[PDB]
Structures are given as structure tokens and as C-alpha cells.
């Protein structure tokens, strides 16, 4: 038997008695008292009992002599017991302490502080003194056990249910008590050779465990070592059910098991912080929960951004080490975090599985601010809930094949040498991420550029295939601050693999998918851009196939020299392929090689460049989809240039196409569309060497503000099997509103053609050069201009209308309708040419023109010129009409013409009409009316040979001015053998009536002449006249 000796009460009021050799009793009366002891030793079988007024009653046993306290017996108390021994304290095997609160400390506490309930411990300890616990230390519910020393070891068991267990190794330890319980502990001050080791069991269920070790040196020496069992089961305490701290120095080598489970609710919170933290093979940190997983933190918080947890410098997870935060029955999985600031080597297993009967998967983050070695396995799958996430973040990360990276975990591994990283560049095994996609867990990889001067620019490099042949729908997002260089397939056969190769929100890098890095998603999305963050990211692509199957492919990014560039042979199969690009000097979209963008629903390409081209396709690119839309804007270049001396652009729309841009320069294209439609709004468009076939309506609208022609077609064959072509050109400059050139053929066999050209200023209207073969069931050409021509067909033009042809023009000073070339306007039912002018001519046929139809109706108005003018010293105008012909205007001048008609009718209302050198045949009546108000002739016929097979020639001239009312001159021949000839001439002033000169042969059945003049000759047959009639001849005048 050995009981403490030298007991002397220094403060407070209490008695010390020894009723037996093995029994020692202390009676406490005051709330606080300090007792100084020469030696505090309890032998085996000896009992030291405290008799205290309450559970909050306070007793202190400060050892002031002897050596290390040797406690082998049982110490029991109804209140709080504090033992201070600078020489250290040892609890042997079988020793038991059971108090309402117990503190063992090697640091002395002043008496004045103690009576004032100020529990602070600092200094006064013997160098190297340790507190070793091999027995059992237990307390009542709400009790606490604290061991603060230079070194603390617990090879026995410690049990503080519902309270706090604190093992600190620091110079100054501050304890805050209230109402007999422990509220907080303040641990500060580094000490030499600090260490707190726990090889036994510590259970603080529904409480907290703090194992803080603040060391002065230990560059690589063990400052904290837990190899036993630490249990803090219960409710998820926000301060953490288990909290470790390695201080600013040392290595926290943990080999035991930490448990913060909750069978009935949410698991506890486990936090492990320090400088260097290594978890051994047997580490079993578990934070599972019945109603949802807890939380685990190794080296810091999420992304290291939690201010309550120190960020570790290096964290190593040896193979076989396990952290489990998965839900057990039903609920969401917890969070497991591995953060370091320099180097993280991870080889262990992390479980963040959701509840089996319900709940989503947890989240796992394995990120290092410097070098990252993630080679272990992670499981955040959910049997019923959504997939979990395995997040990674390093300086720069490169995916590698397999795990044969000469890792140093257990073989040829001296102790704490794993804290010396060797593999520069944050390699990640593709095998790990392969299993992550295979087990229904998302993978997310980020970087972030470090300070300037390092080679860690924040890049991602895929140097290994990434596959997913099993599991439910998963995601995989790679968002770096540098490059997204991909040089390996990312395939998925089973399920969906939604790839998002994003750039960082403030990234200044680019995305390159080359070396035939095919990405198959078996229905998953691919979003290589960001979407709208104005994130400057180039998307270079070379022999990369993007198969989305049933997913949607969206690429976005802005590149000053090249927004999105395509090279080699690319294939992109998806429900919707949406390309969006921007540039400043280069091409916003630049497809150089073969690009086969096979889509089922919609292709959309969008671009905008200040000086370069928005959309610039020069490759052998094929784009087949239901709806393809190319929208671009360019200030100095081209919105949509597809020009290429060798490359051909094939477009196949099952439904319709729409292209928009400032200038749309299409070229060498072969487009099949449902309802094609361009729209250029700045610099017009150009269709050259294309064969654009569309089942239905085509709408080519374009406006040009430059000298370039608005709708410039050259060697284009544009057909509409069932619809109509409607073109709408507008030129505000000295260009042409609509310019047709070269071998152009337009077919609208069941529809219409409407070429509308609105000139401005000196601009001409619609233009025709070369050979233009427009075939349609209805042709309509509309033009409007001021000084140039509203409508002009200088070049050969062929028009075949099953129903009719209509031309309309309005020219202020130029010619409204001008035909200075071989025009062959064949039509079945009707042809009408309407024009109007102020200074120039309304209709001016010059070249060799033939206008075949059943019905021809010309009309025009001119203030000072000639409305209907058909004359050339070489050109011959032929009009072939089965039924009536009508010509109406102010002046009608027909020369060198050869007209055939069923019926015929001129009508001159202002300037009279002139027919000369013509051959006009019309079976039925040839009524010619003309009224002139100037000195020009009313009806002026010369060298004309007019024939009426079955009809009657009728001329009716009125000249209010002094011109000839009806003047016939030269070789005029009139055959009306079956009808009547009636020429009526009304002169005024000094004007004559009917004037006959030259040689006029008027043959008919009945010949009637009528004249009316005031001062002139009513009828004046000056030259040779010859009238042959079979019934009678009538002449009258005044």
C-alpha cells in the first residue's frame, strides 16, 4: 500500500484522513481548494476518495516534490479533481479514475488563479516529463478529461461520454469551465519535442475529442500519432466530433481508426489539420450516418477555403487507407476533403455513397495547391439518388495511363520519406477516373494559375483514354485556367458521359483536341466552351470526332486570331450542334479541313469579327441537319465566306436553312434545302458557282451600302421544285441592286420568281449579263432607281413562263426598262411590261428581242422623253402574240420591228406615236390611236407595211399643236382586204389633217378617210398615193 504523503491544505477548507491503509479520504467543504503534496502516489489496491459538496466542487493536487506520480490504484470522486506534477504522471495497468471532471497537467497553475476559477496551465514543468495513461480514465455524463504535457501517451482507455476529451502538448493551456462542465479549451505555445500519442481507446460519444500538438521543431519528426481507436459517435457537432491539429510543425502520422458515426441520424464531423498529415494503411476515419453521412477534412476545408481549419502543407494517403462518409440506410452522402498547399499523394479509398434506400451521393475533393498524385479509388455512387462527385484541383494536371508511376508508399519506403514528392506534374491515373465513370460517380478537374514565374500555367493534358462502359448517367468536367490539350479518346459505351471541357471564368488559355482524340458520349452532351462569360478560349481541333449520339454538341469561345479552328477530317454527330465563336482580327470560325457535322435536329454557327471573317469555311465540309443557321457579323471582312479554289461546301437541310450576315459571300456550294433564306443587311451577298436546290420557297434578301452589287449571282443554278424564288436586292451606292451574271438558271416550275431591285442615286436596279435562263410558272421583275436603270437585261436572257411575265420599273432620269441584248421572253398566257420615267425612257428595247406570248401589254410614262421606244439601227424587235397587244404611253416609237398579232392597239396620249421601218401583221383590228400636244406627228408611219388578213385598220390622230395629225410618208403599205381602213385626223391651229407623201398603197375592202382642221389642209395627198377599194372610198374634211 502506498498513499500520497505530505498532504497540506494551502487554500480552501478541507480535511485529509486515512481511515485505512488502503483507503485514503479527502473531505471537501469549500468550492475551491489547492492541496500541495510531497508525493501523490496510489499503490495497487489503494483508494483515494474525494468527499466534495457537489459535482462542480473543485480540488487541486499540486505535487511539490518527489518524482513522477505513480497511480496504480483507484481514484474516485464526486466532483472535479486536478492533478499537477511537473515531474510527470503515470497511470499503470488497472488504475481507474472516476470523477465529475479530471485534469492531469505537467504545467503549474498559480493558486490565485485557481481560487478565482481561472484554469490556466503554463510553465513550471520538468524537461522531458510525460503523462502516460495505461489504466482506465472515466467520468460521469457531462464530465471531461484533459492531459496537457510536453508528451502525453494513453495506452489505456479514456471515456468521457457527453463531454470533452482534450490531449494537448503546448506551453500554455487555458480551460474554460461553467456549471461543472467544460465549454472550451485554449491551446497555444510550441514546445520542444512535443508529442501526443494514443495507442489505446478514447470514447467521447455525443462529445468532442481534441488532440492538439504544438511543436517547436520536428522538421519531419512525429508530432502527433494516433494508432488506437477514437470514438465520438452522436450528433453532428459543428465544431467537430473529432478534431486533430498538428500545429505549424511536425507530421501527424495516424494509423488507428477515428469514428464519428450516427446509427440513428447524421454522422459526426472529423477534422484533421496540421503541417504534414499521413494516414497509414490501417487508418479507418469513418463519419457515416444513418440519416446521412457526416463530414471529414484532412488538411483543410473544401478547396482549402475554410478559415477554421489550418491548411496542411503536405497530405499523403497510403494505399489501403480508408475514409468513409457514406450514408448507411437512407440519406445524402457526406463530404471528404483532402487539401494541401504543396503536395498531395492519394492512394486510398474514399466512400461517399448515398443511402441505399434513398439519398444522393456525397462529395469528395482531392485537391492540392501544388503537386497532386491522385491514384486511389473513390466511391460516391447512389443506389437511388443522384451521382456523387470526385473533385480534383492542382496547379497543372496531366492524365496518365495506369498506376505504374513508381509510387513510393510501402516498398522501399523509409519512414516519412513519402513527404518528398518526386513526380513533377500532377499526374492522375486514367484507371482511377475510368472506375469513377464506371461506378456512376461524376469527375470534376480544375486548375488555377500560380504566381508569375512558374511553369505551372494551369494546364490540363489528357495523356490516356478515359472510358465508361458501365453505370448510370455521369458527368465529367475539366475546367482549367490554362490549356485543355486533349490527346486521347474519351469514350463511353454504357450510359451518358456529359463532357464539359470548360476554361476558367478568367482563363487566358485555349482548348486543343488533336491526335485523333475522338470523344464518344453515347448520348451525352459536349460543352467545350463556357456559354456567355466572354471567356476568351480558342477551340483548336484536328482529326477529333465528337460523337454525341443523342446528346447536344455546343462549342463556344473567342479567339482574336481564330475563335474556333477546324482542321483535318472531323466528324460531329449529335441532335444539335451549336458552334459559337468570336474574333477580332482572325476568323471567328475557320473550318480548314473536311468537316462532317451530321446533325439530326439543328446546326447553328455564330460568329462576329471586327476585321476578320466571322464564318469562313474553305474546307470540304459537309453539314447535314434538319435546320442549319449560319449567323455572322463583320465590320471589315466577311460574315459568311465559303470561298475555296478547291474546297466545296455541301449543305443538306431536310426542313430549311437561314443565313444572316453583314456580307454573305457563298461560293462553290451544293445546297439542298426545304426553305432556304439568306439575309444580308450591310454589304449584300454573292452566290457563285453554287447549285442551290430547294423543295420550297427561297428568300434571298440582301442590301449593300458599298459599290459591290447586292444580289450578285454568277454560275448559280437555283431551283425550286415546288416553291418560288423571291430575291430582294437594294444598293445605296453606285453598285447594282441585283446583278445576274454568267450561266444562271432559275426554276420555279410550280411557283413564282420575284427579283426586286431597289437602286439609289446612281445605282442601277436589276442587271442581267451573260446568259440567264429563268424558267418559272410566273416571272416578275421589279426595279426602282433614280439616275441608273430601274430594270436592265443587257446580256442574253431567256424567260419561259407557263402563265405570265411581269416587269416593272420606275426611273427618275435613267431608263426604267432597258433591253440592250438578246432577250427571249416566251410565255403562254400573258406578258406585261410597265414602266415610268421623268427624264429618260420608260421602255427602251434596243437589242434583238423576241417577246412570244398570247397577250402582250406594254405601258410607260415619260415627262420629256419617250415612254415606249423600240428602236436600233441594227436591232430587230419581234413580237408574237396570238391575242391582243396593247401599247400605252405618251410617246410610242417603234422601229425595225416585226410584230405579229391577233389584235393590236396603240394609245399615245401626249407626244403621239411613230411607226417606221416596221412590218406589222395583225389578223383582226389594228386600232392605232395617238394624241399629240407638240409639233411632233400624231400618227407617223413610214416604210411600214401593215397587214390585216381578216380585220380593219383604224387610225385616229389628234394634234392640238401645229404638228401633223396623221402623217404617212414613204413606202406605207396597208392591206385590209377583208375589212375597212379608217384614218381620222384632227388638226388644230395651223396643223394639217391627214398628210400623204411618198408612195402609199392602201388596199382594203372599204377605205374611209376623215379629217378636221381649222387653218391647215384637212386631207393633203402630196406625193404618190394609191387607194384600191372593192366597195367604196370615202373622204371628208373641213
Amino acid at each position, epitope marked *: 500500500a502506498n498513499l500520497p504523503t505530505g498532504g497540506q491544505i494551502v487554500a480552501g477548507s478541507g480535511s485529509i484522513q486515512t481511515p485505512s491503509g488502503n483507503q485514503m479520504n479527502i473531505h471537501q467543504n469549500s468550492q475551491n481548494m489547492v492541496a500541495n503534496w510531497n508525493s501523490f502516489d496510489i499503490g495497487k489496491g489503494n483508494t483515494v476518495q474525494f468527499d466534495q459538496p457537489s459535482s462542480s466542487a473543485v480540488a487541486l493536487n499540486r505535487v511539490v516534490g518527489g518524482g513522477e506520480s505513480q497511480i496504480m490504484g483507484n481514484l474516485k470522486a464526486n466532483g472535479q479533481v486536478f492533478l499537477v506534477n511537473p515531474n510527470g504522471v503515470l497511470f499503470g495497468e488497472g488504475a481507474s479514475v472516476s470523477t465529475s471532471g479530471f485534469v492531469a497537467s505537467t504545467r503549474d497553475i498559480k493558486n490565485d488563479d485557481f481560487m478565482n476559477r481561472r484554469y490556466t496551465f503554463s510553465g513550471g514543468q520538468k524537461a522531458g516529463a510525460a503523462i502516460v495513461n495505461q489504466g482506465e480514465l472515466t467520468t460521469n455524463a457531462g464530465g471531461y478529461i484533459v492531459l496537457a504535457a510536453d508528451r502525453v501517451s494513453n495506452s489505456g482507455t479514456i471515456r468521457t461520454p457527453g463531454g470533452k476529451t482534450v490531449l494537448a502538448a503546448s506551453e500554455r493551456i487555458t480551460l474554460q469551465l461553467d456549471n461543472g462542465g467544460l465549454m472550451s479549451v485554449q491551446v497555444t505555445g510550441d514546445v520542444v519535442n512535443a508529442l501526443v500519442e494514443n495507442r489505446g481507446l478514447v470514447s467521447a460519444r455525443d462529445g468532442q475529442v481534441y488532440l492538439t500538438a504544438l511543436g517547436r521543431g520536428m522538421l519531419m519528426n512525429t508530432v502527433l500519432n494516433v494508432s488506437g481507436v477514437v470514438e465520438a459517435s452522436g450528433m453532428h457537432r459543428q465544431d467537430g466530433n473529432i478534431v486533430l491539429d498538428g500545429g505549424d510543425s511536425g507530421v501527424v502520422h495516424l494509423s488507428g481508426t477515428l469514428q464519428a458515426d450516427n446509427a440513428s441520424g447524421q454522422g459526426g464531423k472529423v477534422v484533421v489539420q496540421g503541417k504534414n498529415i499521413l494516414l497509414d494503411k490501417g487508418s479507418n476515419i469513418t463519419a457515416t450516418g444513418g440519416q446521412g453521412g457526416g463530414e471529414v477534412y484532412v488538411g483543410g476545408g473544401w478547396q482549402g477555403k475554410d478559415s477554421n481549419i489550418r491548411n496542411a502543407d503536405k497530405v499523403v494517403m497510403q494505399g489501403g487507407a480508408r475514409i468513409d462518409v457514406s450514408a448507411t440506410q437512407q440519406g445524402n452522402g457526406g463530404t471528404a476533403v483532402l487539401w494541401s498547399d504543396s503536395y498531395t499523394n492519394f492512394h486510398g479509398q474514399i466512400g461517399a455513397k448515398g443511402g441505399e434506400t434513398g439519398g444522393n451521393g456525397g462529395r469528395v475533393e482531392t485537391s492540392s495547391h501544388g503537386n497532386l498524385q491522385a491514384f486511389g479509388t473513390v466511391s460516391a455512387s447512389a443506389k437511388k439518388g443522384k451521382a456523387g462527385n470526385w473533385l480534383l484541383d492542382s496547379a497543372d494536371i496531366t492524365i496518365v495511363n495506369g498506376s505504374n508511376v513508381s509510387k513510393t508508399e510501402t516498398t522501399q519506403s523509409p519512414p516519412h520519406t513519402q513527404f518528398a514528392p518526386t513526380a513533377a506534374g500532377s499526374a492522375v491515373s486514367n484507371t482511377s477516373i475510368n472506375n469513377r465513370l464506371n461506378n456512376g460517380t461524376s469527375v470534376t478537374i480544375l486548375t488555377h494559375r500560380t504566381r508569375t514565374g512558374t511553369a505551372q500555367g494551369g494546364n490540363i493534358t489528357v495523356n490516356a483514354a478515359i472510358n465508361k462502359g458501365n453505370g448510370s448517367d455521369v458527368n465529367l468536367t475539366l475546367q482549367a485556367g490554362g490549356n485543355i490539350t486533349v490527346n486521347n479518346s474519351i469514350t463511353s459505351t454504357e450510359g451518358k458521359l456529359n463532357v464539359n471541357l470548360s476554361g476558367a471564368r478568367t482563363s487566358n488559355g485555349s482548348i486543343t483536341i488533336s491526335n485523333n482524340a475522338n470523344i464518344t458520349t453515347n448520348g451525352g452532351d459536349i460543352t467545350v466552351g463556357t456559354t456567355n462569360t466572354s471567356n476568351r478560349v480558342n477551340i483548336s481541333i484536328n482529326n477529333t470526332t465528337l460523337n454525341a449520339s443523342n446528346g447536344n454538341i455546343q462549342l463556344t469561345g473567342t479567339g482574336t486570331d481564330s475563335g474556333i479552328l477546324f482542321a483535318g477530317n472531323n466528324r460531329l454527330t449529335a441532335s444539335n450542334i451549336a458552334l459559337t465563336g468570336n474574333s477580332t482580327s482572325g476568323n471567328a470560325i475557320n473550318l480548314t479541313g473536311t468537316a462532317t457535322l451530321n446533325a439530326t435536329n439543328n446546326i447553328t454557327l455564330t460568329g462576329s469579327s471586327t476585321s476578320g471573317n466571322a464564318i469562313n469555311l474553305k474546307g470540304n465540309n459537309t453539314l447535314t441537319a434538319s435546320n442549319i443557321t449560319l449567323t455572322g457579323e463583320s465590320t471589315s471582312g466577311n460574315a459568311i465566306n465559303h470561298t475555296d479554289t478547291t474546297g466545296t461546301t455541301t449543305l443538306n437541310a431536310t426542313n430549311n436553312i437561314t443565313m444572316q450576315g453583314t456580307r454573305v459571300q457563298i461560293k462553290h456550294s451544293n445546297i439542298t434545302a426545304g426553305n432556304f433564306a439568306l439575309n444580308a443587311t450591310v454589304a449584300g451577298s454573292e452566290i457563285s458557282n453554287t447549285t442551290l436546290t430547294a423543295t420550297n420557297n427561297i428568300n434571298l434578301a440582301a442590301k449593300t*451600302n458599298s459599290a459591290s452589287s447586292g444580289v450578285y449571282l454568277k454560275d448559280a443554278r437555283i431551283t425550286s421544285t415546288n416553291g418560288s424564288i423571291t430575291a430582294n436586292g437594294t444598293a*445605296t451606292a453606285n453598285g447594282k441592286a441585283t446583278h445576274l451574271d454568267g450561266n444562271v438558271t432559275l426554276n420555279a416550275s410550280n411557283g413564282r420568281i420575284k427579283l426586286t431591285g*431597289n*437602286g*439609289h*442615286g446612281s445605282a442601277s436596279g436589276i442587271l442581267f449579263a451573260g446568259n440567264n435562263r429563268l424558267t418559272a410558272s410566273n416571272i416578275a421583275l421589279t426595279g*426602282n*432607281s*433614280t439616275s441608273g436603270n430601274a430594270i436592265n437585261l443587257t446580256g442574253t436572257a431567256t424567260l419561259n413562263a407557263t402563265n405570265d411575265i411581269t416587269l*416593272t420599273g*420606275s426611273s*427618275t432620269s435613267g431608263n426604267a426598262i432597258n433591253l440592250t441584248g438578246t432577250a427571249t421572253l416566251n410565255a403562254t398566257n400573258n406578258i406585261t411590261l*410597265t*414602266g*415610268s420615267s*421623268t427624264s429618260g425612257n420608260a421602255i427602251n428595247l434596243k437589242g434583238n428581242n423576241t417577246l412570244t406570248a398570247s397577250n402582250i401589254t406594254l*405601258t410607260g*410614262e415619260s415627262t420629256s422623253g419617250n415612254a415606249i421606244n423600240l428602236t436600233d439601227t441594227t436591232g430587230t424587235t419581234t413580237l408574237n402574240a396570238t391575242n391582243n397587244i396593247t401599247m400605252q404611253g405618251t410617246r410610242v416609237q417603234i422601229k425595225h420591228s416585226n410584230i405579229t398579232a391577233g389584235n393590236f392597239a396603240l394609245n399615245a396620249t401626249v407626244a403621239g406615236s411613230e411607226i417606221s421601218n416596221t412590218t406589222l401583221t395583225a389578223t383582226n383590228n389594228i386600232n392605232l390611236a395617238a394624241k399629240t400636244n407638240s409639233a411632233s406627228s400624231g400618227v407617223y408611219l413610214k416604210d411600214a407595211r401593215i397587214t390585216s388578213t381578216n380585220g380593219s385598220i383604224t387610225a385616229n390622230g389628234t394634234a392640238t399643236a401645229n404638228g401633223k395629225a396623221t402623217h404617212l410618208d414613204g413606202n406605207v403599205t396597208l392591206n385590209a382586204s377583208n375589212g375597212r381602213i379608217k384614218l381620222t385626223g384632227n388638226g388644230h391651229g395651223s396643223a394639217s389633217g391627214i398628210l400623204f407623201a411618198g408612195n402609199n398603197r392602201l388596199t382594203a375592202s372599204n377605205i374611209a378617210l376623215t379629217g378636221n382642221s381649222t387653218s391647215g389642209n384637212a386631207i393633203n395627198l402630196t406625193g404618190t398615193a394609191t387607194l384600191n377599194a372593192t366597195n367604196d372610198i370615202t373622204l371628208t374634211g373641213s
Partner: antibody
Amino acid sequence: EVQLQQSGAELVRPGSSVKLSCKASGYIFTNYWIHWVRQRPIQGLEWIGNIDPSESETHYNQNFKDKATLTVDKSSSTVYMHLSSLTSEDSSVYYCARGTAVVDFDYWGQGTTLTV
Amino acid sequence: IQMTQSPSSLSASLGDRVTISCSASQGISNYLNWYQQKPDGIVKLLIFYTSSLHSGVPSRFSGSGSGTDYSLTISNLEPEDIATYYCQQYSNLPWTFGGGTKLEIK
């Protein structure tokens, strides 16, 4: 000369309807579109809509989209402006104009008074 | 598209160089007509396009400008000119008009 003859003064109670006429002569009726411009009292001019007699194609200002309607009779060379649900606010002088495309409103009608 | 006129009214003397500036809400290229409405109510077209005379236009009328600013100038003022000069844009649908500038004599 090219003339744009309209109807005389038209006065109705608010909430009524009036069909304004724009009769054109001296030019090819199907060679230019007819315009419709309102001069609000002491507030500046405003455009209502146009109809092209060639095909009766119409473009309407959105403000008058439910307020006005245009009809054309090529036989009489006349374009008729229809209105509905008139108020005192719309009481103004309504002009019809001969619009080409590049020459725009080179001739205006005499204008009718629509007091409502 | 909204049209701007300034000044809303102007007073000057016979034969004085008259300038009616007409600023636009944006660059309308040259889609500008200068209608002159006589006080009776007859509305003509004087300068279709930025500077392009109409038929019944005396040589005194002449415009200029590009982009957002345009001006119409009557070189010699005579009492026929007294009217309100609505500058009209027609670049963008719907077409709009200016605020009117009455040209009063002094």
C-alpha cells in the same frame, strides 16, 4: 398631273369607324405603293402603313396595327383606309402618299380632316 | 429609330443663309428625305436622299451630311419658302419623321 385625291372632311362620334379613300390619277396606279401618314395636332408627323396596289401587300405600324386597315381596288385606282374604335386622340389630318421605294413620298394627297 | 430636329423654329431675313440641321438617333447612311409642308397643308418632297434634288425644286435648296448629322440649306430666302420642313428617315422600319422646323421671316 400626278394627283392624289382623297375624301372630304369626316366627323364621327368616338368609338365609330371611318373608311378613308385615296383616289390616284395621272400615273400608273400599279407602279407605286400608296402610303398613309398622320399629322397629329401640334405633335410631329407619324407613319401608319402602306399598301402596294400591285399585289395588295401591306406593312403596318404596330401602333396602328389594330387601329387601321388598308384595302385596294385596282379598277378605280383607289386605296381605301379603314379604321375602327376611333377616339378624340386620333383626331388629326390623315394624308395618303405615293411611295415608290427610292423616291418615297414624291406626292401627297390634299388631306382629310378626321375630327372624332 | 427616333428623329431629332433643331431648332424647332427659326426666324431670319429675306435672302439670308438658312440652315436646318437634322440629327438622327444613329447613322442612317443617307436614307433621308426633306419634305416641305406649306402652311396650307400641301406636303411635297424637296430633297430625296441626303443631297438629291426633286423635280419642282429651285436650285437654292441643297443638302449634305452623312451618318448621324444632316442639314438642309436654302441659299436665298424668299417668302415662298415659309413652311415647316419635316426631315424624314427611311433606313429602318418603321419610318419616322422629324419634329418640324417652321421658317419664319423677320
